[PDB]
Amino acid sequence: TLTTVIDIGNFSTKYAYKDAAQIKVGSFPSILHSYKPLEDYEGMERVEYNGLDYYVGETVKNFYFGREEQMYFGNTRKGHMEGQIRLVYALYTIFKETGAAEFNLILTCPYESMVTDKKYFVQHFEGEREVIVEGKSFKFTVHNIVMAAEGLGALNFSDSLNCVIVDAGSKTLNVLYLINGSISKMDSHTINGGTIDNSIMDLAKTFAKTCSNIDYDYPIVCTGGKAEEMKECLENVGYSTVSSAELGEDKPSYYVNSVGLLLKYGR
Amino acid sequence: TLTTVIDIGNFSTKYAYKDAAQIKVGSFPSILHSYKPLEDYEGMERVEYNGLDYYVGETVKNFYFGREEQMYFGNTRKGHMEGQIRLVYALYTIFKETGAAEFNLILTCPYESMVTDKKYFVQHFEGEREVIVEGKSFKFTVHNIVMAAEGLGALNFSDSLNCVIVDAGSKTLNVLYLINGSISKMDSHTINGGTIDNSIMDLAKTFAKTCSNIDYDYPIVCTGGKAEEMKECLENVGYSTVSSAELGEDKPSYYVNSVGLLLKYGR
Amino acid sequence: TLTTVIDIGNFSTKYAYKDAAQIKVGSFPSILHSYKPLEDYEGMERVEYNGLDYYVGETVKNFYFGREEQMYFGNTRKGHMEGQIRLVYALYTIFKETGAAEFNLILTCPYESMVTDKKYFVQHFEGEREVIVEGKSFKFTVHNIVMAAEGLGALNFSDSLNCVIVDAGSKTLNVLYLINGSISKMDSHTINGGTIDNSIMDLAKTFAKTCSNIDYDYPIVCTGGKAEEMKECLENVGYSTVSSAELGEDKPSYYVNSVGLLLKYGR
Amino acid sequence: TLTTVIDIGNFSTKYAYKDAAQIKVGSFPSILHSYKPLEDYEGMERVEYNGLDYYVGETVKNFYFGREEQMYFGNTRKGHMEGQIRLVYALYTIFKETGAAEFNLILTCPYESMVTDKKYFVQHFEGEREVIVEGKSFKFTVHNIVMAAEGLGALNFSDSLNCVIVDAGSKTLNVLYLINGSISKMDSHTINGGTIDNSIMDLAKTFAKTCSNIDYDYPIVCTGGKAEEMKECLENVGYSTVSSAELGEDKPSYYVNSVGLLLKYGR
Amino acid sequence: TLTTVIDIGNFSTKYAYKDAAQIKVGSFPSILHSYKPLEDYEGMERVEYNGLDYYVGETVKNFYFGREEQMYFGNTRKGHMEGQIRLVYALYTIFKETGAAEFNLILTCPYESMVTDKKYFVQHFEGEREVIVEGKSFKFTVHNIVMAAEGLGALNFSDSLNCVIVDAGSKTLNVLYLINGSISKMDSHTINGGTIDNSIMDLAKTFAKTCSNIDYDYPIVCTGGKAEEMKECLENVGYSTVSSAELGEDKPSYYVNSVGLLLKYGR
Ligand SMILES: Nc1ncnc2c1ncn2[C@@H]1O[C@H](COP(=O)(O)OP(=O)(O)O)[C@@H](O)[C@H]1O
Ligand SMILES: Nc1ncnc2c1ncn2[C@@H]1O[C@H](COP(=O)(O)OP(=O)(O)O)[C@@H](O)[C@H]1O
Ligand SMILES: Nc1ncnc2c1ncn2[C@@H]1O[C@H](COP(=O)(O)OP(=O)(O)O)[C@@H](O)[C@H]1O
Ligand SMILES: Nc1ncnc2c1ncn2[C@@H]1O[C@H](COP(=O)(O)OP(=O)(O)O)[C@@H](O)[C@H]1O
Ligand SMILES: Nc1ncnc2c1ncn2[C@@H]1O[C@H](COP(=O)(O)OP(=O)(O)O)[C@@H](O)[C@H]1O
Ligand SMILES: [Mg+2]
Ligand SMILES: [Mg+2]
Ligand SMILES: [Mg+2]
Ligand SMILES: [Mg+2]
Ligand SMILES: [Mg+2]
């Protein structure tokens, strides 16, 4: 039984798991399109789960040639009748690396939609499910789902236990105000707009307007894919003790929300 | 040559000047947004200064409809690559009332950032500058800048020369401990949080914790926009000789930091 | 029915009671903050009494990370709409040690506010009250309140019956000039400023200015948390017969105002 | 080389010196406070001597607005780590009137602390010292110190050589029983309490209790700042040959302890 | 109407009266202090008479702890604006023993101040006066005052009608040279200094210098509180027929000046 953490995003979908003492990690881009029976596709794979028939892979962006603003799920309630495909293809990708068919899912979600997502993640996933990927059917088992918060993976790489975790996402910012290893509910934002639509210098300045109950000596931990460019544009705003979370060797900044939850949670 | 005082705040930006024996005064709200070329705007005006293109006016708050916690600059180092627009539009508003193009600026700033702000206010303003407001270009001249302290305008309306000036601001409190017409540097706070985010009864009680070297018979001069509600919630704490600064006729309490510096300084 | 003495201070809140022939004693830090619903707190506890909702405990100081000068009630009229929580949580802490729900309160207060505090301590506490601590409701009974003076606990450890009790507090000094086991009202000071804000060498020298009707052979009994450092800095001023009050075994110097009133009063 | 006499008191500090045949005299108030870097002070001056940093001047009483019982050194062993500043600023004030940098100090002290004060006055003052007053450093030289008694200046204005000198001070009475131009050690009091705290009618009556080995025809010479009001309240007690010491023209009664020692001693 | 004799001294105040054939007698110590509102005094009582507010009683000496040379009125003109309180409290003490409110006062005074004291004893006491002792007001009546001499009480216990009465007092000696039951005015001394300040062996030797017109076979009657130690130190000087006056049973030597005037005068 393999306990893994799958950070379903909008630009990409990051999965992390621990087989040996090392952490094996990977991702795949979060662009999927309806079926449209094609002649001979190469860099995409057909996924069928629960009455759906979608292409997930690298070359699904070829379906959106002159309409490239339509290839990204925008700030929309992860785990729809379209967002399940990103999760069950992430389960298949782990199976192509290990051979495990019994999963303990550590899902990530924004903190505002914490108790809301249990309609869609829990009921559709009760063990002994089955996908049909590239014709070949695949059966897996998920018998417990631990729905974490999107941002807490950067807390392991925080020098202070009392900080603000800024998730410089792709369609949304997840400001997560944290006290003692615990998340304050009143002071945690979810700012719309991400690094795809907006520049970081125009996105770090909207952080300084929303979370303006923060003096400039307060610790800020930047995470997300644009983390090391986020802290270079917050220091020009005037914050001082900001530090982006850096992972180990050969793991870039967009695995921080996923790798750090593996190093902390899932007991 | 017109000597004027411009109190750049976070909720609003107050300007005061003296043409006749009277003091002509006014303000405009401190909400500005990036350009976004619009069809036909009515209650806002486009301002271009130094590679910037921002809307300043009454109806800029319509850009922040479902996101009203993003319309206010929060406690952030006045005179950025965004806060210059509030000053040069305040210069334009004076020009629409008098016709003066040579200014002597009496700027206000918090006392903690007194010697720090001279990188941004002095270097960008050296006379013969030019804005482009609503298409029509406008040229002005500023050849001396007197950077005052944010709160000293209430000192003219203080019965005692030895008092504490509490600036019940909008994003910050500027407690300014004063001895003999001079500002003590050790005992002057700058408390984060203002009347927008916090209630006054929860904000006057944080004044009693910080500036607790003050016995209850010591004079406190409340200024700012919420001044006459500030002194009604300090007397419930236990202070006795507190008195908010009242201006003349038809000038409300939020001009005290600006009008009082005109009646005292700028020689 | 348990007769106990609760010395509500500013740095801490000390409670003392007598169950066996020994005196069981304890305290908890006097830092409390508004509610702000948190995810999973560990070293703090929620207290609800009379329309209030506050966290009292060890880790409430984490709410005041970059603003550590805001965590202490400063010289402010004990028993407010915020200071009742320190008393009713002290009643709960005794209940977790004995199981008593009927209390005889020996409260301490400064001598200047002796007859003044009966608006707030008497009327809010008339027996059969109820707190809600950590969800679990708790009912107690207080049917008599003996409001003592803050400093008289050191009188039991005084070799002379005619002395000056110097309460080296945390926000205030309570100089209590005493004749024959009775408190002189004209010669009892209440000096603002304590050991948190001021150093003791700069605080013992303000004692020598105020209470300067004292010749150097007159007995001075130092109490408070900084008592044994208070007498080492009064002897450098020039006082000779000064002696800090020492308790029994395993009771430090900050219980003197509370333990000594149990050994003397509450009949 | 200028031989001068400096009567360090508690209300004021009187210096006297003789340049021409006349006596040039002056004083400055004895209120000093710790440093607290201020913006623009007017009637006070910064004094730095031997690791100290104090304000001495007229307007130092503005630091003690609601706490006016804290501005006076009370009966405390002249020449501390705070009382040296009153002496070295008195040396600076003479230098601003003459230009002398080599001093022969005639210090005054109470007779009880005659041989005791030589730890603090002699060792800290051995010539070639240096103060830093108002930024500008000042070097002086003191190579002999003649420690007189506080009261003997009134002996020159005494018609009898066998009298009692009553020093109606500010924090203390220096009754100095004198026989033949020499001071009796057994019959010289030092009564605590002065004219600041106590009224003279309640202070002259404590003289009649202590020095009650004095019949009513015995000469009493009243000195100090309240001298001519002291003799008007001793005659109501019943003393008959009491006469306050009057100086020359335009020198009030509080220079008697300082001017009279210049006219008698310092050989 | 009760005729009583009240010997106001400096160490104590002795009153004597005759209700039955016996003489009821008593005293109280002559230490009084200004008011200073105290919390709960035990062994002292508040006395208010004629705009005065003083504590008279046993424990008033606690007000003079480190200053014990200030608790005694020294040789100062009995019946001041402070010495009236000792008399009217002596009237109250008689009222607590009998219930009499109409007094015939036999006051004692030194012989030198015989005709002088009638300004203060007669005018302030004209019947129907009123004290306020311990809150409870008390009205009395004094309609004749017989001002005796301090020492004549020992004349009843003198074997010779031609003697010298030596009053070994507390602040003064009242040598009273007596011929035929009548007092010689030229040869009656009043020597300053008493048994408090001076030893008797150093006080009996000053008697031998002043009243040196006395041969050693001449009768000397020692009275006062130190009477039986006075005659033991006059016999070492060389006087032979000296005999201290001894009262009846359970009346010590300090009632002789008061009891003996009751047995002789007041007709
Ligand atoms: N598989 C990947 N390969 C390269 N860059 C990536 C990858 N995944 C994410 N990134 C970088 O991360 C940014 C997106 O941030 P990310 O945290 O992945 O968004 P989300 O919150 O949707 O996961 C992109 O701009 C991209 O530069
Ligand atoms: N132009 C205005 N019209 C009405 N109310 C105002 C105006 N400007 C300020 N106020 C009042 O003042 C408060 C803001 O305080 P203010 O001192 O103006 O903030 P700042 O320190 O940013 O200038 C607001 O809550 C508002 O009630
Ligand atoms: N619970 C505690 N644990 C350890 N030290 C304490 C505690 N409470 C007080 N002290 C000591 O006492 C000092 C504060 O003095 P205290 O008399 O408690 O202040 P207050 O007058 O506000 O009660 C602190 O500096 C601290 O060293
Ligand atoms: N510089 C001064 N100006 C006016 N009055 C003074 C001055 N110095 C002293 N006095 C008077 O003298 C009194 C204090 O007595 P003084 O002998 O100066 O005290 P100290 O013994 O401390 O020197 C004060 O009540 C004041 O009236
Ligand atoms: N009430 C008293 N109790 C005990 N001893 C007393 C009392 N009154 C006087 N004495 C003794 O008398 C002495 C004082 O002499 P006294 O004649 O009382 O003085 P005065 O002339 O002032 O009355 C004291 O030394 C004391 O020993
Ligand atoms: Mg993400
Ligand atoms: Mg403002
Ligand atoms: Mg305390
Ligand atoms: Mg003096
Ligand atoms: Mg007598």
UniProtKB/TrEMBL annotation, chains A, B, C, D, E:
Protein name from the UniProt record: Actin-like protein N-terminal domain-containing protein
Domain Actin-like protein N-terminal span(s) in chain numbering: 6-153
UniProt keywords, alphabetically: Metal-binding, Nucleotide-binding, Plasmid
Binding positions (ADP): 10-11, 14, 170, 225, 254
Native species: Bacillus subtilis
Gene3D superfamilies (alphabetical): 3.30.420.40
Family matches, as InterPro entries: ALP_N (IPR040607), ATPase_NBD (IPR043129)
Range of residues in the leader sequence: none
Binding of Mg(2+), residues: 7, 150
Keyword Metal-binding: yes
